[PDB]
Swiss-Prot record, chain C:
Integrin-binding motif: annotated span: 310-312
Superkingdom of the source species: Viruses
Effect of residue 81 to Y: In strain: Gamma/P.1
Lineage: Viruses, Riboviria, Orthornavirae, Pisuviricota, Pisoniviricetes
Mutation effect (residue 275 to I): In strain: Omicron/XBB.1.5, Omicron/EG.5.1
Species this chain originates from: Severe acute respiratory syndrome coronavirus 2
Name of this protein: Spike protein S1
Interval of the full protein contained in this chain: 47 to 436 of 1273
Outcome of swapping residue 107 to E: In strain: Omicron/XBB.1.5, Omicron/EG.5.1
From Swiss-Prot, chain E:
High-level lineage: Viruses, Riboviria, Orthornavirae, Pisuviricota, Pisoniviricetes
Intrachain disulfide bonds: 12-34, 17-23
Parent-protein start and end of this portion: 727 to 774 of 1273
Superkingdom assignment: Viruses
Protein name: Spike protein S2
Function comment: Precursor of the fusion protein processed in the biosynthesis of the S protein and the formation of virus particle. Mediates fusion of the virion and cellular membranes by functioning as a class I viral fusion protein. Contains two viral fusion peptides that are unmasked after cleavage. The S2/S2' cleavage occurs during virus entry at the cell membrane by host TMPRSS2 or during endocytosis by host CSTL.
């Protein structure tokens, strides 16, 4: 770019004019090139800051999902995170998030608590789930129905304040033996 | 010549724009007008003693949306932030700076909050966004036999939950998904 | 490379007038004229250019013959058909290899198509040619670059165009060039395989602003659109304030030169039509300003010195002059910024 | 947390050389010093659109709340969309939209009333005068509220299942039981004091509306973003009023008053001033864009963690032991309800 | 982990025109150019 001077080629302009009048065009070229370089370096600094933030995020994700399992949802990929395997990329990194995702689900029933005899039973872990006829217990993320025993539940209550409580019987392995 | 883009040279203040009647409150000694940013807004007529406002001429920006040239040569023109009747009369009067002229069938007209779209036809259906145009409007190359269609982006599949007092769904099965991320 | 340049080019899908032959209307030449003609062996000889085409302005003559050329910057008189009748003010005789070469593979079906382009930017006449026995139907579709042959600095006035024919016992394709920005695809051997306009189609403008020949799906911001104003109004204050020029021109006792009355003119709009209509002048010589350009200049002060004088004394009164009046009655300063009026 | 700001598409060509052919020719001697600015601005607009898309469009399926609204005594009318309101916004969303004032809306098509301004023309007409326009955002303030509504309906009728896989309905009581279980208290206390916790939650929801109403400026972050953008725009516009060391600040006046080869120095001075000012504006806009991008990434991860499930990191989702968060759309930003 | 860095309040007039009336006057011809810098440094100090 001539930058408002006689010519854009320095070796010619010095070879086309003598110094004491060429130095004006030399100064014009100097300022044009210097401003262009300043714009370039500022843009490079912006890009470097952005890529630094991205690399810090990548390092955190690496140390989380690869060197252990992260409970942050939608962080190590969509769904329940299991692991992640890194891959090398040109000027970058590639992750392979292995995620556990549920599948076919069915309406069964629920009850916030089960009252056997004047006392409310709550699941130690999981849902009180009813087939439709018999109450059962299982996990949250998988359907593994089990017989309601005193080991799967802990009792604390009075069977009068739990809104939506349901009636059934609970089992215990100690009375039989 | 009011209500027209006209080059004005009022008493040595030369510029471009559209002038019309105003309801200012010019004092008798007042001659010029301005705004907060010090740009000439209103001028008093030196031979009529009336007040006229100065406007930009037709400022906007042309953006072209297109599929891959290896796919098709059809293109659509966006005129950013301009009422689509104004471009219509300007085209018919042949005073637009762009010399390239995209043909107007009347069916390819679209007053959008982002401007006026020429060369695409409205489909009231909803699809996933392909080419972002703006204001919740997206275009894609779709068969009728092929053309460029404009539609409001589909936010996603319409789904409703089955929430109840005592109804729950527990996954009886599960899947393993390996995603990727860069 | 995908170099972009701005110069007078023939627009793509522009309008080209096709003529025949069996009179020779003189087409206007402005910003260059494109030419093409396909022929069996020969029916065309040369071209003549210039304004009014007579022995008063320099013109051009490009007659070609069997072996060489006859380009000459001449001021020929007239032929109305031995093609010139005057060579007084004629120079720049130039002779070289003929522009047209004909190749035939033992049959005339290979109609040699010849493409010529001329322009006169800052003089420096340029001639462009690429000759090939193309398909031969007519003005074809396939791309073709143009090879320069002669760059010659004529530097004369040029306004009209005409061409010279041959004897015997489908051509004339004429186009015009406009200032446009183009893209030119350069082959790795350097040839131009394909070129694109930037002011023809929106797609072409996209390929321009994103300089390339393949555009991916997406939106691109190319340029801006502005409605060019139709009419231009000039408005100035209702002030008239006519100067006393009437009173200095309608007087009845214009003072003698020895006692020249000097009138001071201020606070008025100096319209010169009032002096134009009042006196049938005989000497309106202006020194500091242009007589045409008096109504667009604002003057701090104007003096109107009026005195009736003899005839030769009208020519006597001028800056840097002498004489019985110019030395003893009135002497005009050498740095006189003004005009005199004699009627 | 602010998410985005107004998208500008300054055009240096006639921003600097208002319809002056010779000025354009002079600018042509400065190389591609304009394409850089145009590309940078369009890139900034693209990143802002991407920011809002990441921070909001997290669920592919749009959900709607059941017609009946009785979630175990809990009250959500203050955050659910209002069918009576034609914009379908929450009452809190209305307060956020009304407590923020935008100088430049963007989707106005204000051309046609600048001549009809009667009074002195405003900031937007002033910007339109000298080659500065605002590009409206892709995601309108309307359907974005639809996104927030879908997210809110997902998190109260399905817990956090819909953020990992298919949406599985869980009633709000035992959803709160599980949120209690995830912090270290058994569900029994919730099942005893359901009425008390419902009343406390309702009271807090009611009080936060008054807190936002009576505060002088609690949305000060979004207002500061808007004010900074407007101030930068205003100073950019005002910079055309500086002679920059030439005869006058009016290019057309200089052109019509002096000859080409002498007004050349003055117009070159004007170019060097105006372009450099535009450079400062562009660089400052780049810094602000980087800052808002970082803030939007923080907002996106905060929404993904707190809103779509229970977060174990302290103070991240508000002060105290976190249970859930509710998202609300704001002008150019988001508002969270921890 | 760094937390803050030294807050600065550079002054246009003193820095570029040491107590020179004509220098300040010719600075004023550049418009509100450096008021942006003063605002930026103030914002930096507040941010820190
Ligand atoms: C309730 O859950 C029961 C699980 O024990 C299901 O009962 C089963 O019934 C078969 C005979 O049909 C028995 O052989 C089996 O041992 C089991 O008891 C029952 O289907 C289920 N009811 C509903 C409505 O889902
Ligand atoms: C569960 O079964 C209980 C008896 O084992 C029921 O308690 C009874 O409640 C009735 C009134 O509903 C009393 O009159 C009676 O004395 C006894 O307390 C209980 O109601 C029942 N609940 C449900 C939800 O089935
Ligand atoms: C859970 O879903 C799996 C697929 O995601 C099922 O595995 C399938 O098993 C069938 C044969 O039964 C194969 O043909 C198929 O390729 C796949 O391996 C699995 O059966 C299913 N289990 C339950 C309990 O639903
Ligand atoms: C550039 O010019 C080269 C020299 O003529 C071309 O190479 C030739 O290609 C021909 C086949 O067309 C060979 O037979 C010959 O031996 C030589 O390699 C080359 O093709 C050409 N490139 C172009 C036109 O793109
Ligand atoms: C949920 O909370 C709403 C608060 O907006 C309650 O609405 C109230 O309605 C009364 C009159 O019905 C108004 O006076 C009051 O200002 C408020 O708008 C709504 O009743 C409440 N519903 C339940 C079931 O708690
Ligand atoms: C639960 O029942 C509702 C009632 O309509 C139904 O829409 C939903 O699909 C059911 N969910 C299942 C069967 O998983
Ligand atoms: C302007 O001058 C003309 C000519 O005398 C007159 O008819 C007209 O009324 C004047 N108008 C004003 C506003 O002075
Ligand atoms: C712009 O929109 C339409 C179409 O031109 C019309 O009402 C009028 O021209 C403008 N209206 C407003 C409100 O700007
Ligand atoms: C179909 O599109 C037209 C306009 O193109 C619109 O008026 C109409 O409401 C649409 N129909 C439906 C069902 O959306
Ligand atoms: C849930 O129970 C409440 C009160 O017991 C009732 O108002 C509501 O209609 C019920 N809804 C469903 C889906 O059972
Ligand atoms: C060329 O001119 C003819 C007749 O004047 C007209 O029919 C045709 O449309 C023109 N072509 C173009 C490209 O303007
Ligand atoms: C053709 O023109 C050249 C031009 O110099 C001339 O020398 C020659 O005599 C002419 N005639 C033939 C037959 O070449
Ligand atoms: C050639 O120019 C001379 C003046 O230099 C002129 O007298 C003469 O008439 C011209 N020849 C023409 C017009 O044929
Ligand atoms: C003097 O004025 C009269 C009246 O306007 C006009 O008819 C006449 O031509 C004028 N004569 C001169 C010499 O100005
Ligand atoms: C100038 O003075 C002479 C003196 O004889 C007089 O005749 C003439 O009218 C005067 N011109 C004016 C006053 O314009």
């Amino acid at each position: 770019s001539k930058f408002g001077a006689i010519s854009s080629v320095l070796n010619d302009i010095l070879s086309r004019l003598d110094p004491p009048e060429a130095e004006v065009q030399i100064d014009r070229l100097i300022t044009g090139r210097l401003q262009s370089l300043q714009t370039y370096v500022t843009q490079q600094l912006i890009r470097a800051a952005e890529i630094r933030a991205s690399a810090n995020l990548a390092a955190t994700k690496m140390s989380e999902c690869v060197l252990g399992q992260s409970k942050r949802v939608d962080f190590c990929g969509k769904g329940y995170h299991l692991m992640s395997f890194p891959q090398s990329a040109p000027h970058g990194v590639v992750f392979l998030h292995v995620t556990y995702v549920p599948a076919q689900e069915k309406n069964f029933t629920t009850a916030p608590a089960i009252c056997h005899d004047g006392k409310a039973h709550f699941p130690r872990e999981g849902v009180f789930v009813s087939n439709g006829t018999h109450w059962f217990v299982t996990q949250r993320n998988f359907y593994e129905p089990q017989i309601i025993t005193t080991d799967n539940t802990f009792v604390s209550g009075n069977c009068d304040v739990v809104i939506g409580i349901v009636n059934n019987t609970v089992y215990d392995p100690l009375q039989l033996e | 010549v009011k209500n027209k883009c006209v080059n004005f040279n009022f008493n040595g203040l030369t510029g471009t724009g559209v002038l019309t009647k105003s309801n200012k409150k010019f004092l008798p000694f007042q001659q010029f007008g301005r705004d907060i940013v010090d740009t000439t807004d209103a001028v008093r007529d030196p031979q009529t003693l009336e007040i006229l406002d100065i406007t930009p001429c037709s400022f906007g920006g042309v953006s072209v949306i297109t599929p891959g040239t290896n796919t098709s040569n059809q293109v659509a023109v966006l005129y950013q932030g301009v009422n689509c009747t104004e471009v219509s009369v300007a085209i018919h009067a042949d005073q637009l700076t762009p010399t390239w002229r995209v043909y107007s069938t009347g069916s390819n007209v679209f007053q959008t909050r982002a401007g006026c779209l020429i060369g695409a036809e409205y489909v009231n259906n909803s699809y996933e966004c392909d080419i972002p145009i703006g204001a919740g409007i997206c275009a894609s190359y779709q068969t009728q036999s092929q053309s460029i269609i404009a539609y409001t982006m589909s936010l996603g599949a319409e789904n409703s939950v089955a929430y109840s007092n005592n109804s729950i769904a527990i996954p009886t099965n599960f899947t393993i998904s390996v995603t990727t991320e860069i | 490379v995908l170099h972009l340049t701005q110069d007078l080019f023939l627009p793509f899908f522009s309008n080209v007038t096709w003529f025949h032959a069996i009179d020779n209307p003189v087409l206007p030449f402005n910003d260059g004229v494109y030419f093409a003609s396909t022929e069996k062996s020969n029916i065309i000889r040369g071209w003549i250019f210039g304004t009014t085409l007579d022995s008063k302005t320099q013109s051009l003559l490009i007659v070609n013959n069997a072996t060489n050329v006859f380009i000459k910057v001449c001021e020929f008189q007239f032929c109305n058909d031995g093609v010139y009748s005057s060579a007084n003010n004629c120079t720049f005789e130039y002779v070289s290899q003929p522009f047209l070469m004909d190749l035939e593979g033992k049959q005339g079906n290979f109609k040699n198509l010849r493409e010529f382009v001329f322009k006169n930017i800052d003089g420096y006449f340029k001639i462009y040619s690429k000759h090939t026995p193309i398909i031969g139907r007519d003005f074809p579709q396939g791309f073709s670059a143009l090879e320069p042959l002669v760059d010659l600095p004529i530097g004369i006035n040029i306004t009209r165009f005409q061409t010279l024919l041959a004897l015997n016992r489908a051509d004339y394709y004429v186009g015009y060039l406009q200032p446009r920005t183009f893209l030119l695809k350069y082959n790795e051997n350097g040839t131009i395989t394909d070129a694109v306009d930037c002011a023809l189609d929106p797609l072409s403008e996209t390929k321009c602003t994103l300089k390339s020949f393949t555009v991916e799906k997406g939106i691109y911001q190319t340029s801006n659109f502005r409605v060019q104003p139709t009419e231009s109004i000039v408005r100035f204050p209702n002030v008239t304030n006519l100067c006393p020029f009437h009173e200095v021109f309608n007087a009845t006792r214009f003072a003698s030169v020895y006692a020249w009355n000097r009138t001071r003119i201020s606070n008025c709009v100096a319209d010169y039509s009032v002096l134009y209509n009042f006196a049938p002048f005989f000497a309106f010589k202006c020194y500091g300003v242009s007589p045409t350009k008096l109504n667009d200049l604002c003057f701090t002060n104007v003096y109107a010195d009026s005195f009736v004088i003899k005839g030769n004394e009208v020519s006597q009164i001028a800056p840097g002059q002498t004489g019985n009046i110019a030395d003893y009655n009135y002497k005009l300063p050498d740095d006189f910024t003004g005009c005199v009026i004699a009627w | 947390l602010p998410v985005s700001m107004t998208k500008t598409s300054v055009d240096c060509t006639m921003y600097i050389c208002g319809d002056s052919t010779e000025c354009s020719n002079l600018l042509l001697q400065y190389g591609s010093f304009c394409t850089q600015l145009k590309r940078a601005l369009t890139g900034i607009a693209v990143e802002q659109d991407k920011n809002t898309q990441e921070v909001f469009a997290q669920v592919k399926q749009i959900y709607k709340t059941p017609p009946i609204k009785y979630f175990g005594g809990f009250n959500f009318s203050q955050i659910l969309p209002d069918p009576s309101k034609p914009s379908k916004r929450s009452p809190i969303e209305d307060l956020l939209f009304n407590k923020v004032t935008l100088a430049d809306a963007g989707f106005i098509k204000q051309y046609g009333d600048c001549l009809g301004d009667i009074a002195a023309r405003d900031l937007i007409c002033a910007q339109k005068f000298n080659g500065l326009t605002v590009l409206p955002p892709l995601l309108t303030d309307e359907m974005i509220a639809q996104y927030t509504s879908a997210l809110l309906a997902g998190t109260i009728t399905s817990g956090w299942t819909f953020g990992a896989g298919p949406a599985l309905q869980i009633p709000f009581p035992m959803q709160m039981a599980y949120r209690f279980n995830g912090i270290g208290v058994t569900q029994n206390v919730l099942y005893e004091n359901q009425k008390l916790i419902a009343n406390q939650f309702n009271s807090a929801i009611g009080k936060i509306q008054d807190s936002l109403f009576s505060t002088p400026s609690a949305l000060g972050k979004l207002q500061d973003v808007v004010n900074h953008n407007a101030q930068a725009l205003n100073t950019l516009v005002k910079q055309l009023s500086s002679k920059f060391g030439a005869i006058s600040s009016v290019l057309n006046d200089i052109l019509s008053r002096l000859d080409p080869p002498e007004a050349e120095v003055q117009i070159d001075r004007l170019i060097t001033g105006r372009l450099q000012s535009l450079q400062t504006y562009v660089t400052q806009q780049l810094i602000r864009a980087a800052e808002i991008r970082a803030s939007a990434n923080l907002a996106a991860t905060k929404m993904s963690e707190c809103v779509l499930g229970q977060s174990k990191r302290v103070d991240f989702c508000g002060k105290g032991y976190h249970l859930m968060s509710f998202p609300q759309s704001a002008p150019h930003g988001v508002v969270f309800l921890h």
